[PDB]
Amino acid sequence: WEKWKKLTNAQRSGLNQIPNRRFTLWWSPTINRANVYVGFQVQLDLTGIFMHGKIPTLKISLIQIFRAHLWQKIHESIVMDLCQVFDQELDALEIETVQKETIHPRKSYKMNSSCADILLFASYKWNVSRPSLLADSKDVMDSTTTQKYWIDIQLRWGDYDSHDIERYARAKFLDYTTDNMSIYPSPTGVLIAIDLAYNLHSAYGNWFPGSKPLIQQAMAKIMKANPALYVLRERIRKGLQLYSSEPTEPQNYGELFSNQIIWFVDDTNVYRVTIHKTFEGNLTTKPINGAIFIFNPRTGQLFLKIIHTSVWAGQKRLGQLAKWKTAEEVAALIRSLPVEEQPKQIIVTRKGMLDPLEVHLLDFPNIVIKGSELQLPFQACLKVEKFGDLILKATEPQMVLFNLYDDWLKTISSYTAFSRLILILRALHVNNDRAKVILKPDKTTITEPHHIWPTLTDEEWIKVEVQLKDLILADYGKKNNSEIRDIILGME
């Protein structure tokens, strides 16, 4: 926060309004909420912000942010970009023509009724589902057909009391489609809600084949890329006088740590054999216990489903029947799970094992399953002392749960704890020995018995981050005579 000439009387006195102005802009979704006592509602001038009073400090901040018709320019850029996406993918989607309605220059900031933005002309016919949320999957493109689609973009500026944009998009859709003033040139379309104060987005409407992934991707790219939005965000930052400190502006995991679950599964080492020779010259090996690794890094949670060789008796060949077990086991997992730890997308090391669990997971068919394009060193979780001996001497196949994020979620992110983890896992993967000596540098570094890793400080933590990554690079060089990020993280 923001570390001659001779002035007239009223310059050498009277307060400075600028720090008051920026305190109000910062605290502004609270100072300007919707649930008030007495207060008469009013629309900011050329936009769709509501005030419920007269707070001149706040009104001045907000007005000077949205100068020069920035609100409509935002509406116009967002509609153009959607158009262009359809300009391009006409082919796969059967779009014969794309119709951008020549704009009412006030459609963006009239808030109780709506023209439409995009008119979609099929080639032949679309069969179309019932409406659901842009975050809901199972869609039955059966109910009707048409050549006419409309698409709506509605911008709001939410506040502390009300910034859920799912229910916003739902209510605006239901209402605006069953009202008697909004002229929709079809009985079918979609509504896309942007929340400019919180940079949120979603949509509700009647869908057809392709629409869900198409929009999902186009929206997530606009919200990041669009140039109007960039001018918005930039007037906001400069009216706050906020600066970043990170250089470099700090792939899936920007999708992955989200409040929606994603699991990481390792079943490459559930079957292992330990080899020692006979008096006979033949090096005979004894099978040993294993473990399915299920990970949630937005939590630091492992389910360790240890496999017993109780199942090595009369099952013919190891690997594919092991695929089969892992499948039915994760199925039982989802069965036993409660309604706030239910998984949403699960990525396994074995891209060859998706199919058996694919089929087995139909009792819980909401599961986006995938094989991970970035392997993460849970195979290096065979190395540690607690987990290993646990598995090794267990007798009955079983479940355990660890929080690898020992105390970290108090003073780092799930982001940062996941990154640091990747460091540690790959460090056991690559050396295990320089790993021991790097992560226990001080002679009397300790671990609390419920920890996977010691009790450090931030100083040596940053030092050892650089150290472990130095090691990963050193060893890549030794055995081979964006890149650093992705080698740290996983596959390439």
Place this chain on the structure above:
Amino acid sequence: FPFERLYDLNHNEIGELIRMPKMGKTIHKYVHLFPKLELSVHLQPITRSTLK
């Protein structure tokens, strides 16, 4: 829009295919000008080795 079902539409629904309704009637002109024939035929046997 098959070479079979193209005159199955009129120059309204013919142009309804690719939504180019200033060109639909010219399209139908091209179709109806492409020589296309039907035919009817009767077969009656003379003997087990001949059918006229």
Place this chain on the structure above:
Amino acid sequence: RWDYQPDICKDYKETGFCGFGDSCKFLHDRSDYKHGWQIERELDEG
């Protein structure tokens, strides 16, 4: 309603200079730009 008169310190806007400086209870802004009613009226007359 429509909140009609924005608060455009007109000494600043026209002459780049407000005698009050930091305490001007209006918006220091030299931006010419079509208003909230100019456009409405011109378009409807068009």
Place this chain on the structure above:
Amino acid sequence: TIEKIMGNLGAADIDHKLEEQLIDGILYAFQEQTTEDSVMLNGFGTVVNALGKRVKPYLPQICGTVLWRLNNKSAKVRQQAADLISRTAVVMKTCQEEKLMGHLGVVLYEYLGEEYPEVLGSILGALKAIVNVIGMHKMTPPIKDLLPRLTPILKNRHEKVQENCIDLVGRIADRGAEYVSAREWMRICFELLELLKAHKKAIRRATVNTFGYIAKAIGPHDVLATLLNNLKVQERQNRVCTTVAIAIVAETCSPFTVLPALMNEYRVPELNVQNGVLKSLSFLFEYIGE
């Protein structure tokens, strides 16, 4: 090396993946920068100067980098990113960066509010080096709003920001000059009258040139009236510059327009002004010649 190399040779044979890793190592070097050096600047300038039209697809990348730097906390990196913009300014357009060169235009119009002279000067430099490529009548902030914003900066009493500001206003008054009102030009005249006391001589020569351009755009008579009243000041630095400025106005707009007023002012009974008149005729006969 690479800079020397491609600067002498050209970048004809540099293939796809090669140019990629090059542009990327470039971005790195420039962020990683930890010294105040023209090393990485010139490297960048040359490398894109030779990539010519090869650079189209990374303009999101290149700018996004530069902009995130423009957001930083410490002045130095901010200033650096302003510099780098002033380098690549020409190719920014020449690859037809509607969204992107539009970006840089309006976003710098934003940062015109800085109060670190070291960044404000570089911002003015970058705006000037954009306006050079893209002319006035398609500038992204129309100069009709730019120059009104610039006039309150001419009072910034610092050599670098003053240098670059008077440069930008001199460009505009030379070529733009008609997207602004007579009254604006008059106020800006009154502000120039006290750049003539900067401690650096580049500033003062730029000031005199723009008095010339303003005399071309508006007529000479009001600017000449405002110059005589300055001759009445003391402390000779101002008189020497204004008397130069009078000579310049007379040279551009023919000397018969100004000679009667000068001669008549030779009658006010004060010393500094009679000597101002004589010195101005000195410069005038030098400048017009035959």
